[PDB]
Amino acid sequence: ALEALNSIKDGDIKNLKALKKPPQIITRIFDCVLVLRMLPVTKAEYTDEKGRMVQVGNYPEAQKMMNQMSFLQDLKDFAKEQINDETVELLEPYFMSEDFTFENAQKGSGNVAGLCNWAESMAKYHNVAKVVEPKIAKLREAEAE
Amino acid sequence: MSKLNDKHERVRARVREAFILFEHKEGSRLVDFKDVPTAVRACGVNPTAVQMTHILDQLAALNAETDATGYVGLENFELVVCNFLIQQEASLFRDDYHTLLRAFRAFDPDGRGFIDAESFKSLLTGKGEALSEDELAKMMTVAADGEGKIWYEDYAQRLANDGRTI
Amino acid sequence: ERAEFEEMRETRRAQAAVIIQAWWRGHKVRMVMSGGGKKGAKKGGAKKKK
Amino acid sequence: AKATTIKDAIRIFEERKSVVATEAEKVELHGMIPPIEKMDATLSTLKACKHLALSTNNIEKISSLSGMENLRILSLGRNLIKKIENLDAVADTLEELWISYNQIASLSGIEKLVNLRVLYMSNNKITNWGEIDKLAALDKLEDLLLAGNPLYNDYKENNATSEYRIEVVKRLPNLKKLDGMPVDVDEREQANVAR
């Protein structure tokens, strides 16, 4: 999962910059990655569409956060012993829905598939670290005993 | 109910008009805390020292939840003044002249019709809501005549007719 | 009866003093307001040409 | 298609996980379709619930937390909660509170969570250090997250993240982790000398 993050250092940034205001269907997963990065978002049914009933991302927030040059550091700087409690709290409805499928992601463009793969890899990393923490605690207790 | 809501709207308009008179800035919807004892008396009521202290404490408690800028919000001041005025009208009926006449008669056991100004000043200085010497001098200036006799009937009539428009 | 009267007269006088002081406060504030804002009218410059 | 009741959320969670809500330690009624708008007393049946997740909904007020004797984790993020209140029912067993991103500007009442250990309420409406000063009453608080608040952003845009962390550690000398980064001994010393 970690090696899948640094390989997307600049191609996704360039493609998203040239994407020219993408629609909300992939703005949803873009804001998913944004919440994983833990940046402020407004919380309401903004531009809500009937049929999904999911917290679809806003229109101008994606444009505001697209031109930021810090995305390379966002996709690079991370460490262990993380809980990602806020992200696992706010990312449930996107897992409940079925609009993040790989087949749906590849329909848009190459950057969509890479961003979805990055989000999935980071979620798997968070889950595996959450499993690891009590395990390593038990290992150190057993070593002391 | 609709009638209750309309009456509340009228009371809101009246209390907003009263609040605007003590605004620190025009349209700021804020009143200085030091003028709150002066502003509460402006609404046709006569709060006691205990009542004003309770109003100040309630306003401070309400403003503790918001930014402590030293100014009282229009909504909070309006709610507090509305509650106090409604309670005063409900309990103390508007027989203000008779209430003040009884209060003044409490100081005249013999029913002579007049009360000594120096004794009045001493009693108000030592008893009840102890007031300042400037305030006492204002009392003698307003009430006492050239002979030093305070006709409590006329003084109570003047006190009750203090421009309070119902 | 004398003890009761001695207590009652003092309590009544204290209550009357409190009431009259509060009502005088209100009357004083209302006299101050009735002394309306006769602010000094600043004589603005009378521009003649335009 | 306006709001989801607690009973509807319970039935959906039971359909998803094939487990009874009353017997499940981790109850997941969060992210319902449509989002839940009101929190009611049906949740009192979750006696064995240690992880209640009602987050990402349209809940505006916190209420009806009674009946959950074993409640250790409460998740209420991405909601319309503005005030910390009605936490006395589960204050004895609650250790982590997940109320991040909310519209909370005042931290009155958080002192009721005497047993709170993890408090993630980042991206809220905190604009003054007085709210952070209210967190000093939490003796067991070891982790705090406040990234995205106006107070945090004021230092972040001015490149004063270190000063923000020093102030946070000064007001909470026993804090172990801040914004996902453990508090180091140098930061502790700077907070001590500033205090």
UniProtKB/Swiss-Prot annotation, chain A:
Q: Which ranges of the sequence are coiled-coil?
A: 61-92
Q: Where in the cell is it found?
A: Cell projection, Cilium, Flagellum; Cytoplasm, Cytoskeleton, Flagellum axoneme
Q: Which family does it belong to?
A: Belongs to the dynein heavy chain family.
In the record's own words, the domains note is: Dynein heavy chains probably consist of an N-terminal stem (which binds cargo and interacts with other dynein components), and the head or motor domain. The motor contains six tandemly-linked AAA domains in the head, which form a ring. A stalk-like structure (formed by two of the coiled coil domains) protrudes between AAA 4 and AAA 5 and terminates in a microtubule-binding site. A seventh domain may also contribute to this ring; it is not clear whether the N-terminus or the C-terminus forms this extra domain.
Assembly and partners are described as: Consists of at least 3 heavy chains (alpha, beta and gamma), 2 intermediate chains and 8 light chains.
Q: What does this protein do?
A: Force generating protein of eukaryotic cilia and flagella. Produces force towards the minus ends of microtubules. Dynein has ATPase activity; the force-producing power stroke is thought to occur on release of ADP.
What is the recorded name of this protein?
Dynein gamma chain, flagellar outer arm
Naturally occurring in which organism (per UniProt): Chlamydomonas reinhardtii
Included stretch of the parent chain: 3136 to 3280 of 4485
Swiss-Prot record, chain B:
* Superkingdom field: Eukaryota
Q: Which InterPro entries match?
A: CALM/Myosin/TropC-like, EF-hand-dom_pair, EF_hand_dom
- Cite a GO CC annotation: motile cilium
Name any one GO molecular function. Answer: calcium ion binding
Query: SUPFAM superfamilies of this UniProt entry?
Result: EF-hand
Q: Where in the cell is it found?
A: Cytoplasm, Cytoskeleton, Flagellum axoneme
Pfam families xrefs: EF-hand_7
Q: Does the keyword Cytoplasm apply?
A: yes
Domain EF-hand as annotated: residue spans:
95-130
Q: What does this protein do?
A: Component of the nexin-dynein regulatory complex (N-DRC), a key regulator of ciliary/flagellar motility which maintains the alignment and integrity of the distal axoneme and regulates microtubule sliding in motile axonemes.
Full protein name? Dynein regulatory complex protein 8
Q: What gene is this protein a product of?
A: DRC8
Swiss-Prot record, chain D:
Q: What is the effect of changing residue 195 to D?
A: Reduces swimming velocity
**Which residues does the UniProt record annotate as the domain LRRCT?**
156-194
Give the keywords, sorted. Cell projection, Cilium, Cytoplasm, Cytoskeleton, Dynein, Flagellum, Leucine-rich repeat, Microtubule, Motor protein, Repeat
Q: Please give the InterPro entries that the UniProt record associates with this protein.
A: Leu-rich_rpt, Leu-rich_rpt_4, LRR_dom_sf
Q: Does the keyword Endoplasmic reticulum apply?
A: no
The subcellular localization recorded is: Cytoplasm, Cytoskeleton, Flagellum axoneme
First and last residues of every LRR repeat: 48-69, 70-91, 93-114, 115-136
Q: Where is this site: Controls the orientation of the C-terminal helical region?
A: 181, 184
A Pfam family assignment: LRR_4
Spell out the GO cellular component terms annotated for this protein, sorted alphabetically and separated by semicolons: microtubule; motile cilium; outer dynein arm
Which consequence is recorded for altering residue 181 to A? Reduces swimming velocity
**What happens on changing residue 195 to A?**
Reduces swimming velocity
Record family assignment: Belongs to the dynein light chain LC1-type family.
Q: How does it assemble?
A: Interacts with OCAD2, a outer arm dynein heavy chain. Interacts with tubulin (previously called p45) located within the A-tubule of the outer doublets in a ATP-independent manner.
What role does this protein play?
Part of the multisubunit axonemal ATPase complexes that generate the force for flagellar motility and govern beat frequency. Component of the outer arm dynein (ODA). May be involved in a mechanosensory feedback mechanism controlling ODA activity based on external conformational cues by tethering the outer arm dynein heavy chain (ODA2) to the A-tubule of the outer doublet microtubules within the axoneme.
Q: Further remark, if any?
A: Outer (ODAs) and inner (IDAs) dynein arms contain the molecular motors that generate the force to move cilia by ATP-dependent reactions. There are two mechanosensory systems that monitor and respond to the mechanical state (curvature) of the axoneme. One system involves the central pair microtubule complex and radial spokes and the second system involves the outer dynein arms.
* Record's protein name: Dynein axonemal light chain 1
Species, as recorded: Chlamydomonas reinhardtii
Name the gene.
LC1
